[PDB]
């Protein structure tokens, strides 16, 4: 056997690890299937993908377009259906008919060999009207034939019947194809909505207290709840409701002791109390957690609960499963760091003495918030536990239950953050935070539009309880505008952490990304009511943003993005396509003045030429505009951070 | 089972076709594998190649390092020994004592923990000793454990006995490697030198005849011989020695129509004299043919034939076996095109009535030209016939005879003269001579020299009789002085075809490549003993360009390769290093006006430091000079077109 086909099909894209891990989609996601296709001589190739479903069966007719002249790469757009594990191939065949029509197109006006010329095509003609099942389409065919063949007629006409509108409809839905070469299928697979598009609310479930009880529950918890939904949110992010130890228990602002009533860090988990199973007994009980994923549902939102794997030194593995931990020649266990960061409340897990239990404990503890209507999940550090452990409990948690997502919060170099994804991990935080610029952002989502988005599903947080990034810090209110709408608009995934509505953006000191007197290690009231009421909140853009984005197909997706030219390097522009619907965005990047600048739009990229004008729609003002070729924009910090455009139909 | 292992070890190369078909080297020949290696968590991890022989013997150690910081990309050079099928594999590893050291160097100063320390370290030198085969080195390990153990010394000296040079060096031999994981194994293919590296002179046998006999024969032709191998090359290509048709036979300039004595073209294969096993009558008998090899033999050439896949319609094959070509239905076979160019003269053969035979026929012949001693192939046009009709061809060879070298004359677009390469030609022509300025040859040697070269090797034919470019046209001497030392120095296997040593270049017309007069279609006796007498031949350059390559190792090889900065356009600049050969390269790309320039060495590039400054020899002169970071360099076309020069050890 040749590992080369009759015509050569080769390097098939997207592929994953060699073909070994599936290339991602979800359902109803657009994106591009490419090979390298040619043959030898100077004949004509053509090209389809056969794109198959769980249960084997074969998608509609799919043909293939050479991408750029000379080049031999060939393209088309596939689109993924009901969830599973599907498969693609891309066949290549001689295209005759294609060869003959050139040739014939010369060779009959120069009078060159005309009778035997119309008789070659003709028996083409006849070859693909016999696999046409269509009896209308085969009388067509043949009516072409018989008029290829009647030598009373001049040569010119003999051919122009066989290139008529209506021949060529027929041959493009029923290709005469030669030599039908295959490639080896590659696996797809295609997971629900939720996977690649939502947007997402953190918030600490113990700051919504009240007066008489500051340590909130479940129940009062959940009065927050709608004013979540109303923000146009889908996801609600818990960070870990678990027990929290009491060793080494961490303080107010990052310090070591904790005095009589802090709290401590809720990643520090495990007490007497329970552990990863458990619910905080402030908290409340596992019947009030029900309740809240309950009213949860009534509004839209599903829970992502938190997966950190590592324990206060007083949770229960500590001393039921001490193989769990790695210890030092006296017999102690080093408390987790992140240097130069410590972590003095928590001790790491190691996996090398029984991989086998934490593997079947993981599950386990998934398996019980899976019953209790958790089907997402934000898995802490995921990069300091091997990752083979989690391609080993992503298989088994989606094997029987395939729509659970799993989201890795993964800031570390690209090898690892790239790995995780495409070893099962459904979402990826990204560098997202860390890039401000124009040049940063431009160049960052290219690459995450880009190869990388057959592996890896970003979800855009612009803060979380870490990182309160310099931006922020010095550009205020507009900077949490800005940020919000380029987080909502270049991803179908982006996120908040609560506070962000607020413009909370003290840091613990200069050159830090950490918050004053962070959540993470105290209660945090906040007046939500006054901020509504005195207007000092952004929820109203946020909301709209995410109304935006509800109606616009061209908002839930990643892989369709085109960067527009500005005069300005605070001025950014780009757009984003799906079936009809165009969105345009022009951001001013300055958070402290007021930035002119003339936006030329990539015309051809938007369907249109050069010329042409069109009516544009800003979503932030029901305000319309008529744009073309070149624009002026004028953006006024505070006032307008960006245009948020529809394309009108 | 995962996909991923314990350490990571993921996207090993060089690759070929995903694994399916091998990477390639030569005997005696170095590259790099790197694969990207990392792990969980902060600590150090290693690497290694294991590269193994077709017995399955593994290589000497071979340890890899971090290419480029925070990149996670690790290589390492390893070196083919005999010819055949080898693979390899890498291997990565937790590396605990490289982390222990570090941390120990910033611990022990610091006073913290020290006992802890330092026992730590014991525990890892003692697990590393149990793994020393040696008994010396076991007791050199076992004495920094006791030191390390030693409690009454102070904690700064207990560290330092662990740290020492004889320490390094054993640890450095065998180290402690944690969860040792491994790749899958990759193919290698080994074959002889001359796949990669030899000099190739073309000429046409007739041409080399007498006054009373213009067509030559073998025996007169083989008078040549001692004239090519004086000049230093290693491999002679002969044009297609079979007999010629004589229906629609070429005349003198590609005219139509032959008048009585024209010789026609050695490309139309094929008479009631014979086919493609038969010698043309002119030339001689098989014994006249073996005679040549055996001259040849005998001064250190090898014979390179023509083996173009093709016809003449007076060829046997016509009536013999009609399937083997595409009949048009008035019984007509379509002459062979490669537009606007006609081959009035042939036919091309189809593949697709019965491969299975024109298989079988085409071994046959090959083995035919085998047994008279005939390893190397110049197969014509490669790229009109199937790709895998050669893949199968080639394994069906080189299975039996793993010596022969195939070289494919395709002159096409980038997929396919890549797959051909790929799916087992030794050799490949490639776009050189239209790769004249300084920009065009240092992107087009950086892609050959780069990944390509994993699976092609390129032979740099300075012309032949089908290319002469308008740099040689417009260019003169000087300009195939330029070409000769270019295709010489940048690539280990160049040619020319006879006739450049002369500059013979008058073209056809303005406008075109092909040569006045050519070869191809008439006899023509060259005066070379007054070329020789009179100075108007190259052939002392070329003489010592093909010694300089035979004293050199630097120049016998292609991978390693560095372009170095000149302030000139018109000035171009590289090295190449093999061992302690280092040669270092300065040409002149203009032809017509003399060039001045400040060549720039990247000197950690030369294994040097910036400041130093190292003695050159300029082997085109014998003249010496001493260079470093700048040099000035003038270069006036005829006198001198570049300095080829070695560094002095
Ligand atoms: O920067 P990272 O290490 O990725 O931070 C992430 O993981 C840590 C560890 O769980 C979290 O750090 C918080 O929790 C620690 C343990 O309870 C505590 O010691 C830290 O001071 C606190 O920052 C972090 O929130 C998480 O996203
Ligand atoms: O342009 P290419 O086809 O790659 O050139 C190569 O193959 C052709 C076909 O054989 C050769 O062209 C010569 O031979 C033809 C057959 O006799 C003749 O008809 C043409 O005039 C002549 O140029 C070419 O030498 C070869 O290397």
Redesign the interface.
């Given at each position: 056997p040749?590992?080369?086909?009759?015509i050569?099909v080769?390097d098939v894209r997207p592929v994953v690890?060699?073909?070994?891990?599936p290339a991602k989609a979800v359902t109803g996601e657009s994106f591009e299937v490419s090979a390298?296709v040619?043959r030898?001589?100077?004949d004509a190739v053509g090209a389809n993908v056969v794109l198959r479903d769980p249960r084997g069966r074969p998608g509609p007719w799919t043909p293939m377009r050479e991408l750029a002249p000379?080049?031999?790469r060939w393209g088309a757009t596939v689109t993924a259906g009901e969830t599973g594990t599907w498969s693609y191939t891309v066949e290549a065949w001689g295209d005759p008919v294609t060869t003959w029509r050139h040739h014939a197109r010369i060779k009959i006006p120069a009078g060159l060999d005309t009778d035997?010329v119309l008789?070659?095509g003709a028996?083409l003609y006849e070859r693909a009207a016999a696999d046409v099942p269509g009896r209308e389409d085969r009388r067509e065919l043949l009516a072409a034939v018989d008029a290829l063949r009647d030598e009373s007629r001049p040569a010119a006409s003999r051919l122009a019947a066989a290139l008529t509108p209506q021949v060529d409809a027929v041959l493009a839905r029923h290709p005469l194809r030669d030599?039908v070469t295959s490639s080896d299928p590659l696996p797809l697979l295609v997971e629900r909505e939720r996977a690649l598009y939502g947007a997402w609310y953190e918030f600490f479930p113990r700051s919504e207290g009240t007066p008489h009880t500051p340590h909130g529950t479940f129940r009062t918890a959940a009065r927050r709840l709608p004013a979540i939904a109303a923000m146009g949110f889908d996801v609600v992010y818990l960070p870990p409701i678990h027990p929290i130890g009491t060793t080494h228990r961490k303080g107010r602002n990052n310090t070591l002791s904790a005095t009589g009533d802090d709290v401590g860090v809720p990643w520090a988990i495990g007490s007497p109390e329970g552990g990863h199973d458990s619910i905080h007994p402030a908290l409340g009980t596992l019947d009030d957690f029900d309740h809240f994923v309950t009213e949860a549902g009534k509004l839209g939102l599903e829970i992502a609960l938190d997966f950190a794997l590592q324990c206060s030194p007083d949770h229960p593995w500590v001393h039921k499963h001490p193989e769990w931990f790695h210890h030092?020649?006296?017999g102690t266990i080093a408390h987790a760091?992140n240097?130069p960061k410590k972590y003095q409340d928590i001790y790491?897990i190691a996996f090398?003495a029984d991989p086998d239990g934490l593997a079947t404990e993981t599950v386990r503890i998934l398996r019980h918030w899976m019953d209790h209507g958790v089907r997402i999940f934000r898995v802490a550090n995921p990069?300091?536990?091997?990752?083979?452990f989690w391609?080993?409990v992503i298989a088994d948690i989606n094997g029987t239950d395939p729509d659970v997502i799993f989201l890795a919060e993964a800031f570390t170099?690209p090898?690892?953050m790239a790995?995780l994804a495409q070893?099962g991990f459904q979402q990826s935080y990204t560098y997202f935070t860390w890039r401000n610029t124009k040049q940063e952002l431009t160049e960052y989502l290219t690459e995450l539009s880009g190869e990388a988005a057959s592996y890896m599903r970003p979800n855009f947080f612009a803060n979380t309880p870490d990182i309160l990034h310099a931006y922020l810090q010095h550009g205020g209110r507009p900077a949490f505008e800005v940020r919000a709408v380029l987080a909502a608009t270049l991803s179908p995934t982006w996120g908040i952490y609560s506070g962000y509505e607020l413009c909370e953006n003290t840091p613990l000191r200069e050159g830090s990304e950490e918050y004053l007197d962070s959540e993470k290690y105290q209660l945090k009231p906040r007046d939500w009511t006054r901020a509504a009421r005195e207007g000092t909140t952004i929820a109203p853009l946020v909301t709209r943003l995410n109304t935006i984005r509800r109606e616009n197909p061209a908002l839930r997706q990643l892989r369709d993005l085109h960067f527009h030219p500005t005069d300005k390097e605070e001025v950014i522009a780009y757009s984003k396509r799906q079936g009809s619907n165009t969105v345009l965005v022009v951001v001013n990047l300055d958070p402290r003045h007021t930035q002119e600048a003339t936006v030329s739009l990539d015309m051809p990229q938007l369907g249109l030429d050069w010329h042409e004008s069109v009516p544009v729609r800003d979503e932030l003002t029901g305000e319309t505009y008529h744009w073309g070729r070149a624009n002026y924009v004028r953006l006024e910090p505070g006032r307008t951070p960006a245009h948020v455009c529809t394309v009108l139909r």
């Open positions: 040749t590992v080369v086909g009759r050569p080769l690890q060699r073909g070994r891990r390298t040619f030898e001589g100077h000379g080049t031999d035997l008789e070659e028996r030599l030092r020649p006296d760091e240097p790491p090398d990069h300091t536990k091997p990752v083979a391609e080993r170099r090898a690892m790995t070893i």
